[PDB]
Every structure is written in C-alpha cells, then in structure tokens.
Amino acid sequence: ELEIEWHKFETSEEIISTYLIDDVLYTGVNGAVYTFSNNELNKTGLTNNNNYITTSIKVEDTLVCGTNNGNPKCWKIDGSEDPKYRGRGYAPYQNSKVTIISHNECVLSDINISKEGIKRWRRFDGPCGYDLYTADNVIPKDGVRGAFVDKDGTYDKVYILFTDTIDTKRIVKIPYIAQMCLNDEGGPSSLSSHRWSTFLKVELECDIDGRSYRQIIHSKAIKTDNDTILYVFFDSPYSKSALCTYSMNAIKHSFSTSKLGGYTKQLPSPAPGICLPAGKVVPHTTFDIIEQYNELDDIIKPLSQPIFEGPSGVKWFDIKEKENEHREYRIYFIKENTIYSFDTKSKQTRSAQVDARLFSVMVTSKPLFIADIGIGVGIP
Amino acid sequence: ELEIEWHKFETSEEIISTYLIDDVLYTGVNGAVYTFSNNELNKTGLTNNNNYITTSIKVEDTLVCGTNNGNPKCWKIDGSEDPKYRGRGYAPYQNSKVTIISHNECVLSDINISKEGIKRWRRFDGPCGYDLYTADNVIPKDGVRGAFVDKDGTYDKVYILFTDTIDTKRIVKIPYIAQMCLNDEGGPSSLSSHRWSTFLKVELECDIDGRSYRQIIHSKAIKTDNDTILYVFFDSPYSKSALCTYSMNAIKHSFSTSKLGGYTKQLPSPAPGICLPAGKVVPHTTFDIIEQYNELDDIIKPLSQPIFEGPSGVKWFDIKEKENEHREYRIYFIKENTIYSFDTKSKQTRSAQVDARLFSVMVTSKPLFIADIGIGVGIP
C-alpha cells in the first residue's frame, strides 16, 4: 500500500536525470532543472534549444551540466556561468543515459568526451590528479551502469559495474564489477600516462534456479557497520529480473588475493590492483600485466539473501532501511508504470499502479518518485 | 479445438514408454505392454514384479524389453521368450528415460549396460558389426535426447541430439547434435576397437530475442523431397520453451566441411567424420584427432521458420503434415495436462485442457495421445 502526494510541473517535461545532492533532489529535465526540497519544487530555467540537462554533480558548488544543442556545457546551480568553463566530459553530446559520480572534488564519469563516441571511464582533472581514461574496448558500448567510491581501508577506491557482451561463438552477456584506485597516477609510459593503472574486474553471478542473470540495470552500495553491501539489479531477455546482494568485503578480498585470469606466472611485488602511496607510479611490468590480463580468475558469488526475482523491465530501485528494525530494508523498485516495494524481512513484495511514465525512485527520508508528471512523495 | 475419444485401460497404469512400430502403438507400462491398432487396445501381460517395460524396438520381430526387478530382459511380442536372450543393453536397470532406435536390424541405444551407470551411446551386435560405445564423458549424464538414422548420400549415418553441461567458471548447458557412421568398424587399436571412430558433434543454436535456449526436450526428423528437416524442442529454466528447425543438409555440409574446434592443423586424408567403404578401418592419426577434438568449430543456425515459443514444461511433440497443403504441418506438443497444436502456416497456437497425466503424443494418421488414463485419438 502506498499513498503518494504529487508536486507536479506545469507541463509533462521529459525527465532526463535525477540526482540526490545532500537530500536535495535535482531533476534534470529538457530545458530547466528542478530542485526538490522540503516539498518545495523550485524550477530553474537555463536554456531550451535542446539542453537536456543530464548532470547535477557537486564539486564545490552543485554545478549542473546539460547539452545545449550538441554542445555540452555546465552552469552554476542558478543558471549562472561556470567559472572554470567545465562541460566537455560532464554532459553527453546527445540525450543518453550517463553515469557520473563525484567524490570530494573529483568527478568520474563515462560520458562521451567527443562526438564520435568511443566509450571510456574517465576521472577528470582535480584534486586526485590529471585526467585518466580506461583503455579501449574495456568498457562496453552499453556504458557503465553503476559507480560508487569506497574506502579500501586506507585508500579510496572507485567501483563500477557494467555488463560486457562477449562474442566468440555466440553472444554472451557477462556482468562485471571493476575496481580502480581513486588517486591513481596513470601508467608509467608516455602513451599510457593518462590510463588507469589499477583497473581490475571480476564477474558477478546472480543464479537462482539454473537461470543466471547477466544484464545489470542499476546498483547501490549501502554502507553498514562491518562493511558495505552492494545491491545489484539484473534484467533478463526472458520475463524476469533479479536483485542480488554482494559483500564488498568479499569483493575486496577477492580483488586482493585472486589471480589474474589467463596469467599463470607470479604476480609482481606491487600487486596489480593495489593502490600505491601518494606520488608513486606503477612500474612497467606490473602495468603491462594489468593491461593485458585485467580480469581475475574468480567469480563473486552473491550473499545468501536478499536474492529475489521481480518483473522484467524494472527501471529503478532504491533502498530505505526500516526505522524499527536494522539491517532490514524496504527496496522500492520501479517499473514504467507500477511501483513495487519489497521487504527484506518479510520477503513479501507489494505492488501499486500509478498512471505516469515513471523515471526513478529516490529515497532521502521518504521515497519520492520522479515521473514525467512531476515528483511524488510516498507514505504507506 | 480437439475432440478425443478414449480407449482407456482397466486401471491407471503408470506409462513408461511409447513407440510407433509400423503404425502400431506399443505402450510400455508397468507390468504389461499395450498394443494399439485400429482403435484396438490389446494388452499383453509379461510379468509384474517391477518390470517397467521400456523398449519396444523392432529387429526381426518386434521384441519388447523391460526391467524385471533390477534385471533387464527382453521378450517376443506375445510374452514369449527371446531366442537370443537379448536384454542387457535393451532395458535399463531401473525406471528411467531411454533413447533406443532400431535401423534395419541394428539396435542403437544409450541404455545403461551395467548397474553403476556410466552413460554411453552404443550400437549393439548385429548386421552392422560388433558392439560400439562412445568414449567416456562424451555423452552427458542426462542422456541422449533424440536419435535418428539418415542417409549421407551413400552411407547410413546416425544422428543424436543431447545437451552437454559444461562447467568451467559457471555451469552452461549447450545443445549438441552428433553424427556417427552406422557401419563404423571401431577404432584402430585394441583398446579403442569397440569405440566409435566417426563421432563428431556441433552446437545447435535456438536464439529468438537474445534469449538462447539450450535444453533439448525432444527431436524428430521429417523426411522431405530435397532433404530432411530436424525439429528440436528446447526448454529453459525460465518460463518458456522454443521449437526450432534445422536443415539436415546444412548440418551434413557443416560436418563435412567445417574444421575441428581447437585443432588448427591440416585434417588427414580420410577426413574425421567421413564414412569409409565397407571393411575399411580408420587410421590411427585420424582416430587420435577424432577422439581428442570431436567438436566442429561451427554452430548450426536454425532455419527461418518455424521458430516459435510455447509454455515451459512441454513434454512431448509430434508432427503431422496437413493433407491439404504441403510442407505445412500441425505440430502437436503436449504438456502434463494440456494439449497444444501449432500450425506452421497460420503460425497460430491452439490449446486444449485434458484431465489426465499425459505422457506422449504419437501421430500415425490421426494424433493419438498416450496418457495414464489410456490412449485417446483426436479429431478436430
């Protein structure tokens, strides 16, 4: 059961992105950007030629970047101009799905940097160092589906989830998680000087009854006491989708200990995925290995629960820990027209119909649902 | 729509096998064997300790073999004793699904030959030659799902469809078709003297919308003018099944021309899968290759139509060409409780409910459905 109150726009404005910046909702739409907070929907127009606003990251001010008519360009929050004139790798050249995260002041994104569009995963210039980019064909043309930053004890690391499409005898999709060192310095050489030197990846695995799911929809890493737990949502070309959970501690341990797939010899002293003390640069042997064989000979198996299967075609999902109990969540996952909630404790799924073209669910303290009608806020 | 008239037994007798011998239905049940012809249901008791009758092949007389209490033993049709005392590889040691075909006088079967039960595909002693068996781990523990004999222009060849379960990093099922020379003489050596020397296999492929099906249920090869067409029915751990069709001419061409997967060098003069003139024996080099790399570097892609998708859990399927048109069939596929027909021309699927625990559909001139209640015969 769910009662949602609707703060709608004046018109049905095609949603293009939704972000949470310090419990303030930033809904990038065509034309303006909407700002939800305290049930207050402040719309701010920027331009309207094409200008699909897609990015609303926060570095120092929450700058907001869009694509004004095939030219990507940023702004300050209130339509003002960006001092640093950011905007190349911050917004796509055309309306697309993006993945752009911002740590302290360090923007990482998969957004296309040029017009042609070779897919790469980049960290842009800032406190971490100069720009970086993954070698080609590493990131699939579909893009990076999830990205989040997590401590590795002492060094920040960036994790990204994507779905590769291998094609040898038949096309097989494979879900991957990939780790990189947030403060990587680049490779050793001059050509490989702006390339990640700590990029590694493992296959995930979400099997239930011999049906293995392989297409990532969306991810979210909740931070708990002993470690953080990663919730992935897989879709399938069949009529099903499946939420799995993985223990980031198990993943980190696997990254640090497992062996590189296809590489049989002894791994060098600064082990490939390992972060390095500030200013250090990966040697050449380690880098040659880490670029040739960048996949561990392993497979991350999910936690025991909650694995569950919902409909096919879910688009978003967000978690909200129940205030009464603890480590028991309500996972609100959203389809084009129908809300669904799932309680990790009772393992029952509730549903609800809503006559709108939903786009996302965000959760700050109460699930707010971003649909083309406008925003809604939910109370059961 | 379908009206079926029911010739039922006196009791609900657990069906264990059904065969068509010259348009006579032979229904092996627990205890007796039933014989349907001209709407006449002649039951013939043989023994009743355990005696799950499973085989009703025809060599010279249609002998019928069962498993009398963990001892496999054959009989003549009318309960009489077998002169040659056949019965080892003709009936399983316990109730199981079997695959046993009979060409002219040459019984081929995957039935377990001993108590332990290593799965192999065997040709038994008779006009073709002495017994033969496939090397171990070639046939999956699930068994061989379909088998039929087809000319290769001049030499008879045996084709078998099974589903391998490869397990390297995750478990993947792979459907395979495999060809052997019916009059193979065995390998060259003394150890490999009763092993097939002409065994090869390719992957099939039944993909529809990026969903690839890999679990074979049942096969049937219809013989047409220019060639024969192979109808395979795949199941999936998801909620779907798919019928595909393959052109045996394409398969034969692929077997004769394609290259052995993993073998990069030049194939020897008596090409591996190639039948040999009577009395000839495969050389040693050809045999070493054919045993090491017995899979072609290829994949058989289905015909254009009819590919279709029906429910998950279908158990049988049989074809009946429409009397009016030609090359247009009615495919009756049967589920545990529900009949389904599918017309290749109209591409519409009809269904029908029947309150019985169906076991199979046979088609002689009118589809007769073998359920535990008894036999039924259908007219639309």
Ligand SMILES: *[C@@H]1O[C@H](CO)[C@@H](O)[C@H](O)[C@H]1NC(C)=O
């Ligand atoms: C929304 O706009 C009104 C209009 O001035 C302003 O008073 C209010 O502070 C704004 N709130 C936010 C969260 O921007």
Ligand SMILES: *[C@@H]1O[C@H](CO)[C@@H](O)[C@H](O)[C@H]1NC(C)=O
């Ligand atoms: C069925 O049994 C009857 C009983 O004698 C016999 O006359 C008839 O020929 C049998 N038919 C077949 C097909 O066995």
